């Protein structure tokens, strides 16, 4: 029993695949990566995401059925699908190693360009230099410079409540470097406080399905480990980021 699926790719094209009705997300992802020319190296740097809003996409958990998400959220409007292929990688050095892969470079470039437009990457200072490289279409040079800007390979979540703030909310920001909570109002306006947690201070982490919360336990300075709860709806996505960061840290090949 076969069905067609549409999926958005980082360069703005879409692709369609014929997959079995009840396929899981990784089975759909492999089929797509086959249909677009991803080889055995490149395929591990991308994954399936769902568009939530103009400023947030969420990674599909392993036991989801992409076709069910496609059908549920389908409209006539462009792109014609809620599914999208995006980069999945926190260690920007692994990116460099792909600077000779035409497929990878092209996808990295076009998504990085979109992330700059959306404010995730803060070029600002060298905006003009990056614009000239963009206009001459020197993708690798563009990426090599943007890779030094604040916000590259950071995952920003929508603001939400937290059991360890008296009032207001937090915007969670995840990167290979640390785990950052930014203080904001209950409306989402950025206040002026940020806490950085190093990954080495993370003792355990977990989800709370019933309480719609991601949970982490840290041991900072000299005190005793405390649990913090972030009441995010995307708590399984957040847990996957933790597992993935530690995995990339374990297999890191460079002192840089």
């Amino acid at each position: 029993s076969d069905v067609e699926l549409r999926v958005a790719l980082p360069d703005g094209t879409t692709v369609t695949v014929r997959v079995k009705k009840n396929s899981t997300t990784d089975q759909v992802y492999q089929a797509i990566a086959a249909k677009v020319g991803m080889d055995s190296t490149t395929v591990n740097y991308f994954a399936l995401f769902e568009v939530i809003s103009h400023s947030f996409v969420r990674k599909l958990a392993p036991n989801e059925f992409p076709h069910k998400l496609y059908i549920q959220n389908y409209t006539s409007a462009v792109p014609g699908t809620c599914l999208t292929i995006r980069k999945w990688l926190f260690t920007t050095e692994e990116e460099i190693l792909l600077n000779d892969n035409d497929l990878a470079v092209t996808y990295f470039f076009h998504q990085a360009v979109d992330d700059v437009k959306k404010g995730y990457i803060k070029a600002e200072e060298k905006s003009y230099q990056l614009q000239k490289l963009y206009e001459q279409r020197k993708m690798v040079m563009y990426l090599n410079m943007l890779r030094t800007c604040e916000g590259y390979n950071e995952i920003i979540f929508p603001h939400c409540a937290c059991d360890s703030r008296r009032k207001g909310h937090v915007i969670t920001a995840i990167s290979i470097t640390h785990f950052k909570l930014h203080a904001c109002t209950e409306e989402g306006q950025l206040e002026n406080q940020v806490i950085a947690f190093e990954w080495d201070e993370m003792q355990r982490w977990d989800t709370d399905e019933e309480g719609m919360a991601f949970c982490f336990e840290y041991a900072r300075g000299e005190k005793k480990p405390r649990w913090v709860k972030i009441f995010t709806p995307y708590f399984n996505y957040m847990h996957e980021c933790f597992e993935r960061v530690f995995c990339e840290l374990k297999w890191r090949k460079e002192e840089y």
């Binding site: 360890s164 703030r165 203080a183 406080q193 913090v228």
Partner: peptide, 6 residues
């Protein structure tokens, strides 16, 4: 306590 305090 509050993270953004002490």
């Amino acid at each position: 306590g509050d993270i953004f305090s002490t």
